[PDB]
């Protein structure tokens, strides 16, 4: 995150760290004990294989992120119809092998429903350890920064990203910079807050640089993506 | 960590070439070690992966049964023997980690490698 402040213990308690080997390679969020949602080009070969991943929820600081403090992950399944080279459809899904403990620290953040109906410049929140700077190193703390909606069409214009932004990818940031997701931040939450309640309106996706000018954050669409993660929760229960 | 891909070269096709990948840092970082391509013009290609302990392997289709991965603990190098090489194998050879190989900007280019030729 670039450009952001520190995280409160709390304050994003759905945020986690996702390690292949206990080395933080990807963001997610927890939406049950069990589900966390986060990018399909975190998981592609080899790491769709669920044995590297471990999951840390509740901490705060990548040096407390011991190995055996987390959450082995059973299964992990990428969106099927994801598309690498394009970015569409950069959603997947990690089950863990043991449910979370929700308490203080560990809460899931809310899938979103339909008619939703938020502004053209939605004011969300993104997380995650990512670098605070270009070509900057993975951050030992979480951070965590206020981004704007930015339509689709403004986002889509010759001098930003001209045409790359399908409907499974919505913007976020600044036109003029200086905020965003970073290396790092992949697969993490961009939330909002409506009606009191925090929703997961976005994955850490893609981007050209970081808080660069006229280059905001992409993520995924979630509301887009809602019917396939239902489908994949509701094959694994029965 | 800090890696350094070494080993290049032009080769005929059929022939063979042998690549090394010095890293240095902390070795609990290098639990999964990888080897991704480049070719002009071209997206990048993963290659190969290795686990630290050897116990688990990786590699693409295009690559799989031509080439093998493997370490050697005591140096902290990983090596990709190329065998059967075809003038598709032409491309620029990285190593790289999970951390670094899994890229919110996929056209950065933060990721220095090997040259390798495959030509008659």
């Known amino acids: 995150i670039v450009g952001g402040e520190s995280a409160l213990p709390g304050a994003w308690p759905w945020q986690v760290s996702l390690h292949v080997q206990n080395v933080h390679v990807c963001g997610g969020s927890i939406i049950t004990p069990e589900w966390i949602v986060t990018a399909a080009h975190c998981v592609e070969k080899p790491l769709n294989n669920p044995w590297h991943w471990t999951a840390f929820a509740g901490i705060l600081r990548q040096s407390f992120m011991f190995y055996g403090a987390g959450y082995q992950v059973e299964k992990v399944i990428s969106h099927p119809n994801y598309d690498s080279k394009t970015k569409n459809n950069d959603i997947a899904l990690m089950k863990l092998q043991k449910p979370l403990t929700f308490n203080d620290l560990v809460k899931p953040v809310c899938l979103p429903n339909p008619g939703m109906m938020l502004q053209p410049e939605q004011l969300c929140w993104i997380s995650g350890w990512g670098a605070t700077e270009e070509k900057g190193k993975t951050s030992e703390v979480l951070n965590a920064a206020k981004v704007l909606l930015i339509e689709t069409q403004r986002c889509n214009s010759r001098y930003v990203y001209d045409n790359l932004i399908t409907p499974a990818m919505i913007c976020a940031g600044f036109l003029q910079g200086n905020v965003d997701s970073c290396q790092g931040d992949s697969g993490g939450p961009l939330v909002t807050s409506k009606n009191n309640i925090w929703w997961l309106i976005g994955d850490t996706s893609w981007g050209s640089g970081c808080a660069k000018a006229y280059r905001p954050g992409v993520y995924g669409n979630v509301m887009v993506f809602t019917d396939w993660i239902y489908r994949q929760m509701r094959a694994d229960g029965e | 960590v800090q890696l350094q891909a070494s080993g290049g070269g032009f080769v005929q096709p059929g022939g063979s070439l042998r690549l090394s990948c010095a890293a240095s840092?902390?070795?609990?970082?290098?639990?999964?070690m990888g080897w991704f391509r480049q070719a002009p013009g071209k997206e990048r290609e993963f290659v190969s992966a290795?686990?630290?302990?050897?116990?688990?392997?990786y590699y693409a289709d295009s690559v799989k049964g031509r080439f093998t991965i493997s370490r050697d603990n005591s140096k902290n190098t990983v090596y990709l023997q190329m065998n059967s090489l075809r003038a598709e194998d032409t491309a620029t050879y990285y190593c790289?980690?999970?951390?670094?190989?899994?890229?919110?900007?996929?056209?950065?280019?933060?990721?220095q490698g090997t040259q390798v030729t495959v030509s008659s």
């Open positions: 790289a980690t999970p951390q670094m190989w899994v890229q919110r900007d996929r056209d950065d280019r933060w990721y």
């Open positions: 840092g902390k070795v609990v970082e290098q639990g999964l």
């Open positions: 290795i686990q630290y302990d050897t116990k688990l392997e």
